[PDB]
Design a protein around this ligand. Structure first.
Ligand SMILES: CC1(C)S[C@H]([C@H](NC(=O)[C@H](N)c2ccccc2)C(=O)O)N[C@H]1C(=O)O
Ligand SMILES: [Zn+2]
Ligand SMILES: [Zn+2]
Length: 242
């Protein structure tokens, strides 16, 4: 019964299986969602996002791979937290991060992505978010484009895994989320570099670290949460691309 991914972390102590998904509490008001894409002849690919309780509402970072899996996330939220889901931020226009947009929209959840992610979305087979985030030259989100974001601190580190990749810190916690930009401290590969900026990747990884200097728990798309060594190692792998 247990899902054993070909890519992505395995289930460990602290993980809750719910439907086709896995959930792990990371802090009093933060959970990691994990969903799995089954590739025939290859196996499962795990992808991770976040769920944040901020006061009386829930904020989501990234969809699951599919609409149905994303609906399962909303069902888990209903059963375990039982608060309205106010908004989602999705971290670039690829299936692991935006495959479930229709499910969010059907539920009345407001969605936000980098303007560039919304521009790329149809070209990448994704439904665009309803609202566009824009960024200063230093990478920080323009505040008026991210209204009522609670503790979420949204940072565009520069082109890396993709040109549109964004990252999210959770103020008042030890957590920062690198999405697919960051790989864990023991990874041997940066994953899919097909859409990547190999010249600028290393600087973008370092910029993420410097934007969230305090965070000790680095959450990412395809590994369990790691130390800041994930940032250092990702940057060192990326140095080799130049
Ligand atoms: C885990 C991945 C190697 S695949 C994923 C993403 N790819 C997709 O979402 C594709 N739709 C896909 C196609 C076939 C099999 C799995 C995923 C990407 O290209 O960044 N993120 C990659 C990554 O984070 O390095
Ligand atoms: Zn991607
Ligand atoms: Zn990915």
């Amino acid at each position: 019964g247990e899902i054993r991914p070909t890519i992505g972390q395995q289930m460990e102590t602290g993980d809750q299986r719910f439907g086709d998904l896995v959930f792990r509490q990371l802090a009093p008001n933060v959970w990691q969602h994990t969903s799995y894409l089954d590739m025939p002849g290859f196996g499962a690919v795990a992808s991770n996002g976040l769920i944040v309780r901020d006061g009386g509402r829930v904020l989501v970072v990234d969809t699951a791979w599919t609409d149905d899996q994303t609906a399962q996330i909303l069902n888990w939220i209903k059963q375990e937290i039982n608060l309205p889901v106010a908004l989602a931020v999705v971290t670039h226009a690829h299936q692991d991060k935006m495959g479930g947009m229709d499910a969010l929209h059907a539920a009345g959840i407001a969605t936000y992505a980098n303007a560039l992610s919304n521009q790329l979305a149809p070209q990448e087979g994704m439904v665009a978010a309803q609202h566009s985030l824009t960024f200063a030259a230093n990478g920080w989100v323009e505040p008026a484009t991210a209204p009522n974001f609670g503790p979420l601190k949204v940072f565009y580190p520069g082109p890396g895994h993709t040109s549109d990749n964004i990252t999210v810190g959770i103020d008042g916690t030890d957590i920062a989320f690198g999405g697919c930009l960051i790989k864990d401290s023991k990874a041997k590969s940066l994953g899919n570099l097909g859409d990547a900026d190999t010249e600028h990747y290393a600087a973008s990884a370092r910029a993420f670290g410097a934007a969230f200097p305090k965070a000790s728990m680095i959450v990412m798309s395809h590994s369990a949460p790691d130390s800041r060594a994930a940032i250092t190692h990702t940057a060192r792998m990326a140095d080799k691309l130049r």
